[PDB]
């Protein structure tokens, strides 16, 4: 929808000044989302890997697909976000919490690029949802997400900050596999 400003555009590419990063509310991720892992498991995402492989030298289709197989792997098939609550659908069962915002963390990847993770924490003893979750979606300022990676854990926020190999990814539930694929065939 909104035209990604020059900043938003470069930011979406890991290039930005820390002074341009701003807090974001949980509502930026409101909606019902589908994990893309089952799509990969059923070959629905092969075209995307084929394209990334016919452009990446030293990388074969299988090598690329193996990279994303590890990256997308998760048992949380669906996520629901609404009115401050995040709900996780695992095995026909669900868990949720009314998450508290804990600021963000600007990361500097070894590739030189930068990224921002938005941290939330569950402070409800009753709940059985992950204690710490972090959103990352190439957005550094208020703006509704179109899809996102989410890191979840029960050890600590720092702990989630070190994870760089597994990043469960989610797209709007209503999108078909074809639509999800076309979207990935861009950015
Ligand atoms: Zn700084
Ligand atoms: Zn469910
Ligand atoms: Zn990403
Ligand atoms: Zn996108």
UniProtKB/Swiss-Prot annotation:
Gene Ontology, cellular component aspect: cytosol; outer membrane-bounded periplasmic space
- The residues the record assigns to binding Zn(2+) 2 are 147, 183, 187
**Where is Zn(2+) 1 bound in this sequence?**
138, 147, 149
Domain of life of the native organism: Bacteria
Cell compartment(s), UniProt: Cytoplasm; Periplasm
The protein's predominant localisation is cytoplasm
Query: What terms describe the molecular function in GO for this protein?
Result: cadmium ion binding; metal ion binding; zinc ion binding
**What InterPro entries has UniProt attached to this entry?**
Calycin, ZinT_dom
Q: What induces it?
A: Repressed by Zur. Up-regulated in response to extreme Zn(2+) deprivation. Also induced by cadmium and hydrogen peroxide.
Cited SUPFAM superfamilies: Lipocalins (SSF50814)
Name the Pfam families for this protein: ZinT
Arranged from A to Z, the UniProt key words for this protein are: Cadmium, Cytoplasm, Metal-binding, Nickel, Periplasm, Signal, Zinc
Q: Which GO terms describe its biological process?
A: cellular response to cadmium ion; cellular response to hydrogen peroxide; cellular response to zinc ion starvation; intracellular zinc ion homeostasis
Would I find Amino-acid biosynthesis among this entry's keywords?
no
Family of this protein:
Belongs to the calycin superfamily. ZinT family.
What is the official name of this protein in its record?
Metal-binding protein ZinT
> Where does this protein come from, organism-wise?
Escherichia coli (strain K12)
Q: What is the lineage of its organism?
A: Bacteria, Pseudomonadati, Pseudomonadota, Gammaproteobacteria, Enterobacterales
The gene for this chain is: zinT
